[PDB]
Design an enzyme around this catalytic site. Structure first.
Site, PDB file in Angstrom:
ATOM      1  N   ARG A  14      11.830   1.110  12.719  1.00  0.00           N
ATOM      2  CA  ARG A  14      12.812   0.928  13.675  1.00  0.00           C
ATOM      3  C   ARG A  14      14.334   1.484  12.869  1.00  0.00           C
ATOM      4  NH1 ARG A  14       9.985  -3.495  13.426  1.00  0.00           N
ATOM      5  NH2 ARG A  14      11.680  -4.399  11.923  1.00  0.00           N
TER       6      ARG A  14
ATOM      7  N   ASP B  74       6.412  -6.245   7.763  1.00  0.00           N
ATOM      8  CA  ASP B  74       6.988  -5.849   9.136  1.00  0.00           C
ATOM      9  C   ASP B  74       5.975  -5.777  10.371  1.00  0.00           C
ATOM     10  OD1 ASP B  74       9.385  -5.227  10.776  1.00  0.00           O
ATOM     11  OD2 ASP B  74       8.494  -3.201  11.037  1.00  0.00           O
ATOM     12  N   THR B  75       4.865  -6.584  10.092  1.00  0.00           N
ATOM     13  CA  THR B  75       3.929  -6.686  11.266  1.00  0.00           C
ATOM     14  C   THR B  75       4.000  -8.101  11.681  1.00  0.00           C
ATOM     15  OG1 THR B  75       2.060  -7.131   9.504  1.00  0.00           O
ATOM     16  CG2 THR B  75       2.603  -4.758  10.587  1.00  0.00           C
TER      17      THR B  75
ATOM     18  N   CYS C 155      -7.047  -2.320  11.637  1.00  0.00           N
ATOM     19  CA  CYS C 155      -6.375  -2.896  10.506  1.00  0.00           C
ATOM     20  C   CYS C 155      -7.168  -3.865   9.269  1.00  0.00           C
ATOM     21  CB  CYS C 155      -5.689  -4.043  11.443  1.00  0.00           C
ATOM     22  SG  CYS C 155      -4.359  -4.847  10.132  1.00  0.00           S
ATOM     23  N   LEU C 156      -6.544  -3.557   8.236  1.00  0.00           N
ATOM     24  CA  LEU C 156      -7.451  -4.100   7.293  1.00  0.00           C
ATOM     25  C   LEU C 156      -6.715  -5.509   6.804  1.00  0.00           C
ATOM     26  CD1 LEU C 156      -7.614  -1.310   4.707  1.00  0.00           C
ATOM     27  CD2 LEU C 156      -9.582  -2.407   5.624  1.00  0.00           C
ATOM     28  N   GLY C 157      -5.587  -5.769   7.481  1.00  0.00           N
ATOM     29  CA  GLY C 157      -4.944  -6.911   7.319  1.00  0.00           C
ATOM     30  C   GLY C 157      -5.152  -7.986   8.226  1.00  0.00           C
TER      31      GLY C 157
HETATM   32  C1  HEM Z   1       0.209  -8.769  14.025  1.00  0.00           C
HETATM   33  C2  HEM Z   1       0.006  -8.206  12.592  1.00  0.00           C
HETATM   34  C3  HEM Z   1      -0.529  -6.868  12.400  1.00  0.00           C
HETATM   35  C4  HEM Z   1      -0.627  -5.820  13.432  1.00  0.00           C
HETATM   36  C5  HEM Z   1      -0.569  -5.938  14.860  1.00  0.00           C
HETATM   37  C6  HEM Z   1      -1.235  -4.576  12.751  1.00  0.00           C
HETATM   38  C7  HEM Z   1      -1.670  -3.450  13.276  1.00  0.00           C
HETATM   39  C8  HEM Z   1      -2.079  -2.541  12.677  1.00  0.00           C
HETATM   40  C9  HEM Z   1      -2.987  -1.162  13.276  1.00  0.00           C
HETATM   41  C10 HEM Z   1      -2.614  -0.793  14.838  1.00  0.00           C
HETATM   42  C11 HEM Z   1      -3.241  -0.379  12.174  1.00  0.00           C
HETATM   43  C12 HEM Z   1      -4.050   1.176  12.603  1.00  0.00           C
HETATM   44  C13 HEM Z   1      -2.765   2.185  12.563  1.00  0.00           C
HETATM   45  C14 HEM Z   1      -3.637   3.503  12.879  1.00  0.00           C
HETATM   46  O1  HEM Z   1      -4.597   3.821  13.126  1.00  0.00           O
HETATM   47  O2  HEM Z   1      -2.540   4.693  12.473  1.00  0.00           O
HETATM   48  C15 HEM Z   1      -3.550  -0.819  11.187  1.00  0.00           C
HETATM   49  C16 HEM Z   1      -3.701  -0.591   9.880  1.00  0.00           C
HETATM   50  C17 HEM Z   1      -3.445  -1.171   8.709  1.00  0.00           C
HETATM   51  N1  HEM Z   1      -3.152  -2.435   8.369  1.00  0.00           N
HETATM   52 FE1  HEM Z   1      -2.539  -3.760   9.984  1.00  0.00          FE
HETATM   53  N2  HEM Z   1      -1.472  -4.867  11.327  1.00  0.00           N
HETATM   54  C18 HEM Z   1      -1.020  -6.100  11.133  1.00  0.00           C
HETATM   55  C19 HEM Z   1      -1.041  -6.904   9.762  1.00  0.00           C
HETATM   56  C20 HEM Z   1      -1.323  -6.240   8.606  1.00  0.00           C
HETATM   57  C21 HEM Z   1      -1.061  -6.873   7.347  1.00  0.00           C
HETATM   58  C22 HEM Z   1      -0.706  -8.207   7.054  1.00  0.00           C
HETATM   59  C23 HEM Z   1      -1.480  -5.928   6.526  1.00  0.00           C
HETATM   60  C24 HEM Z   1      -1.388  -6.032   4.967  1.00  0.00           C
HETATM   61  C25 HEM Z   1      -0.568  -7.152   4.164  1.00  0.00           C
HETATM   62  C26 HEM Z   1      -1.965  -4.880   6.997  1.00  0.00           C
HETATM   63  C27 HEM Z   1      -2.449  -3.674   6.434  1.00  0.00           C
HETATM   64  C28 HEM Z   1      -2.927  -2.554   6.970  1.00  0.00           C
HETATM   65  C29 HEM Z   1      -3.610  -1.320   6.298  1.00  0.00           C
HETATM   66  C30 HEM Z   1      -3.733  -1.148   5.017  1.00  0.00           C
HETATM   67  C31 HEM Z   1      -4.006  -0.448   7.462  1.00  0.00           C
HETATM   68  C32 HEM Z   1      -4.259   0.889   7.410  1.00  0.00           C
HETATM   69  C33 HEM Z   1      -6.176   0.992   7.460  1.00  0.00           C
HETATM   70  C34 HEM Z   1      -6.435   2.497   7.375  1.00  0.00           C
HETATM   71  O3  HEM Z   1      -5.674   3.347   7.586  1.00  0.00           O
HETATM   72  O4  HEM Z   1      -7.551   2.611   7.331  1.00  0.00           O
HETATM   73  N3  HEM Z   1      -1.981  -4.835   8.512  1.00  0.00           N
HETATM   74  N4  HEM Z   1      -2.791  -2.339  11.445  1.00  0.00           N
HETATM   75  C1  LIG Z   2       1.296   1.334  12.254  1.00  0.00           C
HETATM   76  C2  LIG Z   2       1.294   0.411  10.869  1.00  0.00           C
HETATM   77  C3  LIG Z   2       1.527  -1.211  11.631  1.00  0.00           C
HETATM   78  C4  LIG Z   2      -0.068   0.195  10.150  1.00  0.00           C
HETATM   79  C5  LIG Z   2       0.189  -0.714   9.092  1.00  0.00           C
HETATM   80  C6  LIG Z   2       1.699  -0.411   8.679  1.00  0.00           C
HETATM   81  C7  LIG Z   2       1.953   0.610   9.863  1.00  0.00           C
HETATM   82  C8  LIG Z   2       3.672   0.651  10.068  1.00  0.00           C
HETATM   83  C9  LIG Z   2       1.388   1.651   9.526  1.00  0.00           C
HETATM   84  O1  LIG Z   2       2.165   2.771   8.825  1.00  0.00           O
HETATM   85  C10 LIG Z   2      -0.168   1.901   9.428  1.00  0.00           C
END
Ligand code: HEM
Ligand SMILES: CC1(C)[C@@H]2CC[C@@]1(C)C(=O)C2
Ligand SMILES: [K+]
Length: 405
Positions: free
Chosen positions: A177, A242-243, A348-350
């Protein structure tokens, strides 16, 4: 400011939606995006904002495009184009097949086994923050809980000092943002400048923290490079800072405005995980996308090689073709359809960490502070971008109604 319409894009598909400043933002950010799903709006539109790009507006198309990595590549996944071109975080900037070896490594640091191990500390932090707020009868929820609770957990996981949070949080926010003081490329460069010495130190002398694990890790059995480790650690920092931080504020804003919903959760605590899932659908908050690898006709529309397409994960679950009465929160909803955590090979891995944080927050808060509301007169403002959020959330309650555990 509107980019001139490309010759290949039909004029009848133009809908100038601004993902960083949507028209109907004052109504709520999910509301503002849901204007893309009003009656006469097509399934796939072009906006001239932010350099110009496509937007899929319905879950069917969003899901399809996320499954088809041959035509819809993650190499340039952010709008505007300069941000997407600079973006190089791993694994997100990679398509299968070479993406997958890096996911596996990222799973040793945020996967279900790690979350099960953090469970006690997550619980302890939630309880400590909430107990200290409980007698004050008020809080600024964004600063007093939504930011410190998941960020302190991430910094513990990464073995980074908490006093570095303000700087890192500023940088992560400019990527999702931007306030205009930094381009995406500049914010990225700054995050990597932070990480470069820590990655070197931890390769030399490994600990047990996440950065050490990534930086000394292997991918499909060969050692990760310093540059790879940086590109992966940067993305984990962004997910940590930032999620969930933003998602908690949407949820608590909702619960503050809906006593009948908190009542349901106070009376039936077993419903909390299901309520988590329905709030993840209704207050979904992420929107990134992909780049066309070749000219391709999709749903009767000619896409050109190099066009960007925003595929908002937020919108799938808001689509009335996936969930009837999609703006209504129903904790008993039988089939909660959403792509809140993404779809396809980049799921999402998180998400296991995020669900643990959210369910722990709901249980612990509701046990100690069952009755609260928005500060009177507060006009709660949302903000939009790659990850949407809440500007401030002043809450108030009568400490007399609270419960020490
Ligand atoms: C409500 C909380 C969360 C939301 C809604 C969210 C949402 C997402 C989404 C939509 C993606 C896919 C992005 C794409 O396809 O371009 C993603 C990927 C990912 N997220 Fe999350 N996330 C959250 C929490 C977190 C947390 C807490 C972590 C780590 C501390 C994390 C780590 C990652 C990583 C490493 C990926 C990349 C996976 C890949 O590209 O193969 N996420 N997440
Ligand atoms: C779109 C996302 C939520 C996902 C995890 C962090 C984020 C900003 C990315 O760059 C991949
Ligand atoms: K790129």
């Amino acid at each position: 400011n509107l980019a001139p319409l490309p010759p290949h894009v039909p004029e009848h598909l133009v809908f100038d939606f601004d993902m960083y400043n949507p028209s109907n933002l004052s109504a709520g950010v999910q509301e503002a995006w849901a204007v893309l799903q009003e009656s006469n709006v097509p399934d796939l539109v072009w906006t001239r904002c932010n350099g110009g790009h496509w937007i899929a507006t319905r879950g069917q198309l969003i899901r399809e495009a996320y499954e088809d990595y041959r035509h819809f590549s993650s190499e340039c996944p952010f709008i505007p184009r300069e941000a997407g071109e600079a973006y190089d975080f791993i694994p997100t900037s990679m398509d299968p097949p070479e993406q997958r070896q890096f996911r596996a490594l990222a799973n040793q640091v945020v996967g279900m086994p790690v979350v099960d191990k953090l469970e006690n500390r997550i619980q302890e932090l939630a309880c400590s923050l909430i107990e200290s707020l409980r007698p004050q009868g008020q809080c600024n929820f964004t600063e007093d809980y939504a930011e410190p609770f998941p960020i302190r957990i991430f910094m513990l996981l990464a073995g980074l000092p908490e006093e570095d949070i303000p700087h890192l949080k500023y940088l992560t926010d400019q990527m999702t943002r931007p306030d205009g003081s930094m381009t995406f490329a500049e914010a990225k460069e700054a995050l990597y400048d932070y990480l470069i010495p820590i990655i070197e130190q931890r390769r030399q002398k490994p600990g047990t923290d996440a950065i050490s694990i990534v930086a000394n890790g292997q991918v499909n059995g060969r050692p990760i490079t310093s540059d790879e480790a940086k590109r992966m650690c940067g993305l984990l920092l962004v997910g940590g800072l930032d999620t969930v931080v933003n998602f908690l504020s949407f949820s608590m804003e909702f619960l503050a405005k809906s006593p009948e919903h908190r009542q349901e959760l106070i009376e039936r605590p077993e419903r909390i995980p299901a309520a988590c899932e329905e709030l993840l659908r209704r207050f979904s908050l992420v929107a990134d996308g992909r780049i066309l690898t070749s000219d391709y006709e999709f749903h009767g529309v000619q896409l050109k090689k190099g066009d960007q397409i925003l595929l908002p994960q937020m919108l799938s679950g808001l689509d009335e073709r996936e969930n009837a009465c999609p703006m209504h929160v129903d904790f008993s909803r039988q089939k909660v359809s959403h792509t809140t955590f993404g779809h396809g090979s980049h799921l999402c891995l998180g998400q296991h960490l995020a669900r643990r944080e959210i369910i722990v927050t709901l249980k612990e808060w509701l046990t100690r502070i069952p009755d609260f509301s928005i500060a009177p007169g507060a006009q709660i403002q949302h903000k939009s971008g790659i990850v949407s959020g809440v500007q401030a959330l002043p809450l108030v309650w009568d400490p007399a109604t609270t419960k020490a555990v």
